[PDB]
Backbone as a ProteinNet text record, in pm:
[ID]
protein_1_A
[PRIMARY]
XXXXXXXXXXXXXXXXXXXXXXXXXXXXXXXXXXXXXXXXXXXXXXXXXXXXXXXXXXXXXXXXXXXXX
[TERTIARY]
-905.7	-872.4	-993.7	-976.9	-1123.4	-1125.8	-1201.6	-1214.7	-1303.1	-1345.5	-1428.2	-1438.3	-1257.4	-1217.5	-1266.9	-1238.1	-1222.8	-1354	-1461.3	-1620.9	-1601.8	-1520.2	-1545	-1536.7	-1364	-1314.1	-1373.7	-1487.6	-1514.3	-1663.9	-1750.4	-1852.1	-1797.6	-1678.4	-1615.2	-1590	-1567.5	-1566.6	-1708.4	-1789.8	-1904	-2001.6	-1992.7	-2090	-1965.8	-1871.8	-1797.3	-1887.1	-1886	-1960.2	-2119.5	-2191	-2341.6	-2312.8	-2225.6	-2231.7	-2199.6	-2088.7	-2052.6	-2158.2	-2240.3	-2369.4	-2448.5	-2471.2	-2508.8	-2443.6	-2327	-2273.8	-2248.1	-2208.9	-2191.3	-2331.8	-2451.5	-2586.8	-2639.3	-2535.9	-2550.2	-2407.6	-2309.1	-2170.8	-2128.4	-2161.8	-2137.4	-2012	-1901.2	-1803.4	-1693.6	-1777.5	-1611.8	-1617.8	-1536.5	-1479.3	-1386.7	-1363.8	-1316.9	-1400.7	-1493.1	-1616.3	-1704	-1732.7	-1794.4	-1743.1	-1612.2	-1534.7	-1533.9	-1588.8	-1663.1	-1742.8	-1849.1	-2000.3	-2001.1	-1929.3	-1923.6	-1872	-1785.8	-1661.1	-1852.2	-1873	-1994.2	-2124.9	-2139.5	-2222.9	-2207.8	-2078.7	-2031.5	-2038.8	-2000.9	-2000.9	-2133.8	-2274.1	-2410.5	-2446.2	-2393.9	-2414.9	-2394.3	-2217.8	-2194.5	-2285	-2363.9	-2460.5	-2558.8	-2612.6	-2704.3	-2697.8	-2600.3	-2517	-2503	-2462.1	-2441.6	-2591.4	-2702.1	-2812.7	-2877.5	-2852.9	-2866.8	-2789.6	-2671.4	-2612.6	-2662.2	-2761.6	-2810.5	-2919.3	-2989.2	-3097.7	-3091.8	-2996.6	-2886.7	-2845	-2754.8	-2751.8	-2857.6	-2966.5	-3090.3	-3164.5	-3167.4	-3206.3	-3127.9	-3035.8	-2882.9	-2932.5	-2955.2	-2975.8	-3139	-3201.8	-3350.3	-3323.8	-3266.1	-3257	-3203.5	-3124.9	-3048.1	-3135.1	-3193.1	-3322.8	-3417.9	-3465.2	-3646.2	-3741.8	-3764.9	-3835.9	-3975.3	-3981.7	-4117.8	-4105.9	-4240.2	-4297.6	-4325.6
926.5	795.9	719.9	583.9	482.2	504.9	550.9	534	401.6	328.3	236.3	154.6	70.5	0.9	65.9	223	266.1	279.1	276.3	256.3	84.1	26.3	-118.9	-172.6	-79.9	-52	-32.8	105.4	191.4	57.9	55.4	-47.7	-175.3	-207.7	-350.5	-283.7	-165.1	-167.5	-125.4	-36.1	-29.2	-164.7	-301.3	-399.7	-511.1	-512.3	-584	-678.6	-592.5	-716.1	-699.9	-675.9	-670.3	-821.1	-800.7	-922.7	-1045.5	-1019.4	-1125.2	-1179.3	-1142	-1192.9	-1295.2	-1223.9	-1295.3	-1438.6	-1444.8	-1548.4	-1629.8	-1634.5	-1700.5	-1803.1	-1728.3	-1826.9	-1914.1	-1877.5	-1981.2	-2081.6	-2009.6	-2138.6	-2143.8	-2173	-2170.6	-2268.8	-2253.6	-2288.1	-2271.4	-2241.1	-2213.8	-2105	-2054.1	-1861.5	-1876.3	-1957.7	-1957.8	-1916.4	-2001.2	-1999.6	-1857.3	-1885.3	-1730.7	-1604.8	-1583.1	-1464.5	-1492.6	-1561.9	-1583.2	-1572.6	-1605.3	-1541.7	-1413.7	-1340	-1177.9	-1096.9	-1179.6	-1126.2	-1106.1	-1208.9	-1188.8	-1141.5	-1107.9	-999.3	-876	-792.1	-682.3	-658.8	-765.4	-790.6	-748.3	-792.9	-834.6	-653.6	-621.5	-484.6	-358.2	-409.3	-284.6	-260.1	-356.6	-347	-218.6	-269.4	-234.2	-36	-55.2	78.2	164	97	129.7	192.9	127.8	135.7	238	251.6	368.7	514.4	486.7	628.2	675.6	593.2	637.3	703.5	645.3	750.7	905	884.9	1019.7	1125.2	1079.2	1168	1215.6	1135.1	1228.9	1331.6	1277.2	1340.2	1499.3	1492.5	1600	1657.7	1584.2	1706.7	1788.4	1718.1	1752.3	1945.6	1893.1	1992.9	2114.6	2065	2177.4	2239.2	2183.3	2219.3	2263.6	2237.9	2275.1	2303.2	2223.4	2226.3	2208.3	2100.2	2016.4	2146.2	2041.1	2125.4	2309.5
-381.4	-317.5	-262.7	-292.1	-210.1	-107.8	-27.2	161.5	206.7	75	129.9	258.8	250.5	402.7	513.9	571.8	646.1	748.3	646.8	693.1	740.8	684.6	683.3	908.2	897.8	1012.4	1148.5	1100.1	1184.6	1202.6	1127.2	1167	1272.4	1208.3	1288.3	1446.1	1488.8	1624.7	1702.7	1592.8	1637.7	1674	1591.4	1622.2	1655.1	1708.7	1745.6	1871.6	1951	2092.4	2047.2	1966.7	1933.6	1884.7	1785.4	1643.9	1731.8	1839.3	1942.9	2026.1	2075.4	2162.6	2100.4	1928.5	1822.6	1771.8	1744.4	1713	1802.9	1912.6	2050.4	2077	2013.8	2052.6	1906	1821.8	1687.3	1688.6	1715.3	1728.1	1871.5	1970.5	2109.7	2136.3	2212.7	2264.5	2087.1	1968.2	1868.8	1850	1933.4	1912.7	1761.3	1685.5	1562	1471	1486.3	1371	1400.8	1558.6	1584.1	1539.3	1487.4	1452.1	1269.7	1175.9	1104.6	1061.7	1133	1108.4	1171.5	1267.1	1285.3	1108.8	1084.7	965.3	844.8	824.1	738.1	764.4	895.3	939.7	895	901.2	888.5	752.3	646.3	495	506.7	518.1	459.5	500.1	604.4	697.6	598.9	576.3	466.8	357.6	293.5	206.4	226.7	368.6	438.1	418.1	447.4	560.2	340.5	224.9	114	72.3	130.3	45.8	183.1	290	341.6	318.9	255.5	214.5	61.9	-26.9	-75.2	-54.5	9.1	51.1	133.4	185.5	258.3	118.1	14.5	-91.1	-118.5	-152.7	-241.9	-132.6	29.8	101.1	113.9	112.2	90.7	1.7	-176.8	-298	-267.6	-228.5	-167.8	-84.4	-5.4	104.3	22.8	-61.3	-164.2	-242	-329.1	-469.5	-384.4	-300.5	-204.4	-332.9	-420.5	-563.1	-522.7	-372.2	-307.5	-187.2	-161.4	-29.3	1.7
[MASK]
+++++++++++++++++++++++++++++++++++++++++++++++++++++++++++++++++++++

């Protein structure tokens, strides 16, 4: 089964008031729009967070093989 959402979830409560501090000083007084540019923060993030769990796998098969060092 995809678990993808569920990372989606768990990030959205982790940078919930981070992303809020943030958007509040680019759209100030529209809590509409500000919950917008949070929504596509979290989007650009998951990327982020994708291209860090790659480097985590190879780090993982690394530890396994010990071929180096």
């Amino acid at each position: 089964m995809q678990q993808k959402q569920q990372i989606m979830a768990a990030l959205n409560s982790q940078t919930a008031v981070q992303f809020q501090q943030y958007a509040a000083q680019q759209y100030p007084g529209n809590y509409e729009q500000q919950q917008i540019l949070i929504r596509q923060l979290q989007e650009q993030h998951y990327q982020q967070y994708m291209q860090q769990l790659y480097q985590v796998q190879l780090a993982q098969q690394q530890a396994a093989l010990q071929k180096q060092q």
